[PDB]
Amino acid sequence: TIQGSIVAIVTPMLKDGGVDWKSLEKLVEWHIEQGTNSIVAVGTTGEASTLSMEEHTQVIKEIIRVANKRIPIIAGTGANSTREAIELTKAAKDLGADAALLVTPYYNKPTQEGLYQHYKAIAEAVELPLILYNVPGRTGVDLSNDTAVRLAEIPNIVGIKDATGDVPRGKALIDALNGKMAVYSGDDETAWELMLLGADGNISVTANIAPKAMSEVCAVAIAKDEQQAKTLNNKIANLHNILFCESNPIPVKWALHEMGLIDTGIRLPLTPLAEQYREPLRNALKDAGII
Amino acid sequence: TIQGSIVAIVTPMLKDGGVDWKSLEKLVEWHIEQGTNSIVAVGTTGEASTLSMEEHTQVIKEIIRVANKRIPIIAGTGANSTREAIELTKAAKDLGADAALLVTPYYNKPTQEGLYQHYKAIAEAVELPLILYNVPGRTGVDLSNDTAVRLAEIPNIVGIKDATGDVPRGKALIDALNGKMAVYSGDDETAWELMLLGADGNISVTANIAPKAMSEVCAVAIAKDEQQAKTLNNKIANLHNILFCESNPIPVKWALHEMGLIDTGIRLPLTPLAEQYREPLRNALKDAGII
């Protein structure tokens, strides 16, 4: 059901790392005004790892309050402990989130059956639309297409964020699912392709700085207009690359800082974008017409 | 300083998943009488990921209690949040742990400088010996030898658990450090080699089921007796492979259950060793003289 450009919103912070509430509010309003179709609160780009339990909740509550039902809000509720994921997901349901996004448990490397049981348990514990999220390079585990297809059979699992950036594999997943659940790109570089091939949207990092342009890219790609999709994506294509010169969200938070939208706060172990990457980033933003 | 066979103890659990305190006490006593030189409490193998804050504290407390100062106790206190790592490490210090083991932040992929700032902040916040731990395959990040050498200059950072299983790389690290801090193997398959090349010990998984044998392997390897280390390691070499047929600690917990030392409890997302691997594992244990 949720389709289009789905921004993986950063969590603005003060210089001392405290959550920058006013700046977050402005961002949410700007996204809605700019055409962003949905927001993922407190996901990887939002530094879920370094926010406390209370902050995780405050941020979700704030984004929901400011969005005021204008666009669906997806809450990042993944954890590498099934017990904890259930807790976070329930909190999200209770706060009024429209769906929850759950990255596969990271670092502890569960088996494929373990991943199946992990998500099955959460789906059965919380009546809320759940989106799976696979990003092996970060987690140490790869949720296979086969496992994803099995999970698509479970009530409440309505989709998967495929951040592999492996298009053939993504197309294979889409074809095997045959509409059973949605597929979202989790790789800005190839998102336009995956959507042309059947993905329902892009849970984007780039949409953080070019929400209007990415909104348009998703729209025409979903419409299966290959020429337009390719033409519009080319305009923001270098951005998809430069926003990962250092681990996301380091570059994207700096980009927004250069845009005058947020301050420099970011929590250890993450660090402000290294100096050698700032000019190139500023150039890229000027080139794409952002600043 | 802490040298020899250092077991990354499992956290015994009842069938419902609750911590099996009685089995834990027996295990600790068994390790002390069998020759184990030190215990890492609530590390990876001890399912740190699925234990709550309180259970974490209690497991460390119980292990410290039963050991009764007979062998040093290392507390696993890693987290992908610097603030959390500090709180966990301070807690371990207060409980009387001898040192703390901290895996590199996983999932959020900090930069090398971020890894440096992460550990420095912890070292400056807590007066306790700290042991770094690198295991890229699980974390999504690789703490380079260069970064490790820099960190060795920080007061209170006294060692690194190298789980790369890359012997030439480990040797390069040992030589560059020239004693500034200790290097421990984090790969049972190659541990004997790394210790012959200068590592201070092996923070092992295999030691969970063959504590006496591993204590001997470490002793002779530390003594630089190459033939004895090869001969003794050869007898348990197959165990080093089989204990990873599925993600650790899944196999080693089943191994201990077959040995009648612990029950089947293990927390989702982890699952009991898949049925098809149980006979093969039993045979490996029989071949090695363990059961």
Side-chain angles (χ1 to χ4, degrees), chain A residues 78-85 103-108 110 118, chain B residues 48-50 106 267-270:
Chain A
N80 61 359
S81 136
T82 304
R83 171 201 105 247
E84 187 178 335
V103 70
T104 56
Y106 39 77
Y107 183 69
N108 54 2
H118 170 78
Chain B
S49 294
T50 54
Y106 38 78
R267 304 182 179 185
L268 282 169
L270 299 189

Side-chain angles (χ1 to χ4, degrees), chain A residues 47-225:
Chain A
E47 286 170 83
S49 292
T50 55
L51 292 179
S52 64
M53 174 79 119
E54 161 206 86
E55 293 175 309
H56 186 97
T57 283
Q58 283 175 297
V59 169
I60 289 169
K61 185 173 303 179
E62 275 295 288
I63 293 177
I64 285 174
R65 174 183 73 84
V66 174
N68 191 37
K69 295 299 177 259
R70 288 174 289 175
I71 56 181
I73 300 300
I74 303 172
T77 62
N80 61 359
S81 136
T82 304
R83 171 201 105 247
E84 187 178 335
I86 289 176
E87 285 171 19
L88 294 169
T89 306
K90 277 161 167 184
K93 177 188 169 59
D94 288 349
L95 295 174
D98 299 278
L101 177 68
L102 297 92
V103 70
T104 56
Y106 39 77
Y107 183 69
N108 54 2
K109 313 193 295 184
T111 66
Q112 292 300 117
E113 182 56 20
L115 285 171
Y116 177 80
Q117 292 299 326
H118 170 78
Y119 287 117
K120 181 170 180 284
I122 301 163
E124 279 170 9
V126 190
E127 174 158 288
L128 183 77
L130 309 179
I131 300 180
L132 314 179
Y133 168 28
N134 191 46
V135 56
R138 286 185 179 268
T139 66
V141 73
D142 187 354
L143 177 83
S144 76
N145 277 0
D146 285 351
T147 302
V149 169
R150 282 174 70 202
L151 285 171
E153 297 292 331
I154 292 54
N156 299 326
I157 297 176
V158 306
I160 174 165
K161 172 177 177 194
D162 180 354
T164 60
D166 180 342
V167 184
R169 179 188 163 152
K171 181 188 182 303
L173 176 60
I174 291 163
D175 292 341
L177 285 168
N178 191 40
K180 198 45 176 150
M181 78 167 172
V183 168
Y184 297 102
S185 168
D187 178 55
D188 282 302
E189 174 172 13
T190 59
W192 62 288
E193 297 191 63
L194 205 62
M195 283 179 293
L196 280 176
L197 291 162
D200 284 293
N202 179 26
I203 296 179
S204 168
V205 169
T206 303
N208 268 287
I209 58 165
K212 177 136 177 159
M214 179 52 72
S215 191
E216 296 174 351
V217 171
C218 292
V220 310
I222 294 169
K224 304 288 166 292
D225 186 325

Side-chain angles (χ1 to χ4, degrees), chain B residues 176-277:
Chain B
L177 288 172
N178 190 42
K180 189 48 177 173
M181 88 170 163
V183 172
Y184 299 104
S185 169
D187 181 56
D188 285 302
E189 181 181 0
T190 55
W192 66 280
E193 298 180 69
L194 204 62
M195 284 178 297
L196 281 176
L197 289 172
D200 288 284
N202 175 29
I203 295 176
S204 140
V205 170
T206 305
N208 274 286
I209 65 175
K212 181 177 294 309
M214 186 46 73
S215 73
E216 298 174 350
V217 168
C218 293
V220 303
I222 294 169
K224 304 295 167 288
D225 195 317
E226 176 172 33
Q227 194 43 263
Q228 281 199 59
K230 283 181 198 174
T231 305
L232 297 175
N233 182 72
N234 187 250
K235 307 182 193 196
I236 56 179
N238 287 168
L239 297 179
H240 303 325
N241 289 146
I242 209 164
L243 289 176
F244 298 88
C245 52
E246 287 212 299
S247 306
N248 172 63
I250 292 173
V252 73
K253 285 196 105 181
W254 197 263
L256 284 168
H257 172 63
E258 291 289 355
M259 292 163 72
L261 298 181
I262 65 181
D263 213 324
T264 61
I266 194 172
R267 304 182 179 185
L268 282 169
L270 299 189
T271 47
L273 184 66
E275 291 176 299
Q276 64 265 36
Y277 297 113

Side-chain angles (χ1 to χ4, degrees), chain B residues 21-284:
Chain B
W21 303 107
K22 272 163 143 49
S23 289
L24 176 58
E25 173 159 6
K26 271 192 262 302
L27 264 205
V28 177
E29 199 69 43
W30 178 63
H31 275 291
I32 294 169
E33 42 184 60
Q34 290 289 291
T36 297
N37 307 106
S38 178
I39 294 169
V40 166
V42 183
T44 309
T45 308
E47 293 172 76
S49 294
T50 54
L51 293 185
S52 61
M53 182 75 92
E54 297 77 15
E55 285 171 316
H56 183 88
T57 280
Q58 287 311 305
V59 171
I60 288 156
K61 196 173 171 162
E62 271 298 288
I63 290 175
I64 292 180
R65 182 181 68 77
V66 178
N68 192 38
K69 296 164 195 264
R70 284 177 289 172
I71 58 173
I73 304 301
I74 301 168
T77 61
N80 62 354
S81 162
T82 303
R83 190 196 57 245
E84 194 187 340
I86 289 173
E87 156 179 40
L88 285 173
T89 304
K90 161 61 170 174
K93 171 178 178 55
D94 291 345
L95 294 173
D98 296 281
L101 174 70
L102 299 98
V103 64
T104 57
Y106 38 78
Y107 187 63
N108 53 0
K109 307 195 288 173
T111 63
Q112 290 305 293
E113 178 59 19
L115 287 176
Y116 177 81
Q117 288 303 324
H118 172 75
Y119 287 117
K120 183 179 189 289
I122 298 160
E124 294 179 356
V126 190
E127 183 151 60
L128 185 75
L130 311 179
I131 294 169
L132 317 178
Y133 171 26
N134 190 48
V135 56
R138 288 179 175 276
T139 65
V141 76
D142 185 354
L143 188 152
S144 76
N145 276 4
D146 286 353
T147 303
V149 167
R150 281 173 74 196
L151 283 169
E153 300 292 338
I154 308 285
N156 287 335
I157 294 181
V158 307
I160 186 167
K161 178 185 173 183
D162 176 355
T164 61
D166 189 331
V167 181
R169 174 180 165 167
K171 181 203 202 279
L173 173 63
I174 289 166
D175 296 346
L177 288 172
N178 190 42
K180 189 48 177 173
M181 88 170 163
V183 172
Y184 299 104
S185 169
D187 181 56
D188 285 302
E189 181 181 0
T190 55
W192 66 280
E193 298 180 69
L194 204 62
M195 284 178 297
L196 281 176
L197 289 172
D200 288 284
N202 175 29
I203 295 176
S204 140
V205 170
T206 305
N208 274 286
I209 65 175
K212 181 177 294 309
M214 186 46 73
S215 73
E216 298 174 350
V217 168
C218 293
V220 303
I222 294 169
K224 304 295 167 288
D225 195 317
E226 176 172 33
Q227 194 43 263
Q228 281 199 59
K230 283 181 198 174
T231 305
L232 297 175
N233 182 72
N234 187 250
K235 307 182 193 196
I236 56 179
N238 287 168
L239 297 179
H240 303 325
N241 289 146
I242 209 164
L243 289 176
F244 298 88
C245 52
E246 287 212 299
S247 306
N248 172 63
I250 292 173
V252 73
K253 285 196 105 181
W254 197 263
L256 284 168
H257 172 63
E258 291 289 355
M259 292 163 72
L261 298 181
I262 65 181
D263 213 324
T264 61
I266 194 172
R267 304 182 179 185
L268 282 169
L270 299 189
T271 47
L273 184 66
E275 291 176 299
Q276 64 265 36
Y277 297 113
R278 301 177 192 182
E279 180 56 19
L281 174 56
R282 286 194 289 269
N283 284 162

